């Protein structure tokens, strides 16, 4: 049932920790504060069931995965974090209270992802010894309380596994907050691949 072995789910931390941490320090260099980013969680789940572990309007930012990885690349951020993130990219403290959006702060927090998963995929890119490209970073708002709304396509198929990545985030004079990320299995043994080759080249 579980294709994700102990070791697949321990790089998907540490590739994370670097990765999401890069997406972290061009952030606070746009911004003026420190920001930290940790993966306290790593969770295998059933395509079928992805959508049932998010309530509420929120926003999903996807990007598409060229040459050296193939594959949909999932962001799943809550209004609130949305809003401080806009809030902060628009001038502000950040610490507003209103899970309020409209198109001038999506069009900012498109900006942020667009600087932010651009170091992750590079990052990466270093990190495995391989060229991934990505598409621009597209943002919508899914509502996971419409029963008629499907989660993005990270897999074709109900019965397939994905990897439901968790990240807290630590904004300087800002409470914690976290957002979601979840890839294919089948990326995520594609990049073990890269991952154990140079792991063996000691």
């Known amino acids: ?23 972290a320090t061009t952030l606070s260099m746009i911004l003026g504060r420190d920001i ?13 069931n992805v959508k049932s572990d998010f309530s509420g309007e929120q926003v999903v930012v996807s990007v598409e995965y060229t040459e050296g990885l193939e594959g949909l690349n999932v962001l799943v951020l809550d209004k609130k974090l949305v809003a401080v993130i806009a809030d902060l990219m628009m001038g502000g403290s ?3 209270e209103t899970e309020e959006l409209d198109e001038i ?9 667009n600087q932010m998963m651009g170091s992750a995929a590079t990052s990466l ?23 008629n709304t499907q989660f993005p396509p990270v897999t ?11 990240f807290e985030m630590e904004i300087e004079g800002l409470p914690k907050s976290k957002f979601y990320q979840v890839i294919s299995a089948d990326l995520v043994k594609k990049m073990y691949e890269y991952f154990t080759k140079k792991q063996s080249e000691a």
């Open 36 to 48: 930290h980013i940790t993966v306290p969680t790593v969770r295998e789940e059933k395509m079928k």
């Open 125 to 147: 890119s270093e990190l495995l010894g391989i060229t991934i490209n990505i598409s621009p970073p597209k943002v919508e708002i899914l509502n996971f309380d419409d029963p």
């Open 105 to 113: 702060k999506l069009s900012a927090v498109g900006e942020a992802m």
């Open 1 to 23: 049932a579980m294709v994700l072995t102990p070791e697949e789910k321990d790089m998907i931390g540490e590739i994370g920790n670097i990765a999401m941490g890069s997406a």
């Open 156 to 166: 074709d198929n109900p019965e397939k596994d994905v990897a439901v990545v968790e």
């Open 94 to 96: 950040g610490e507003v």
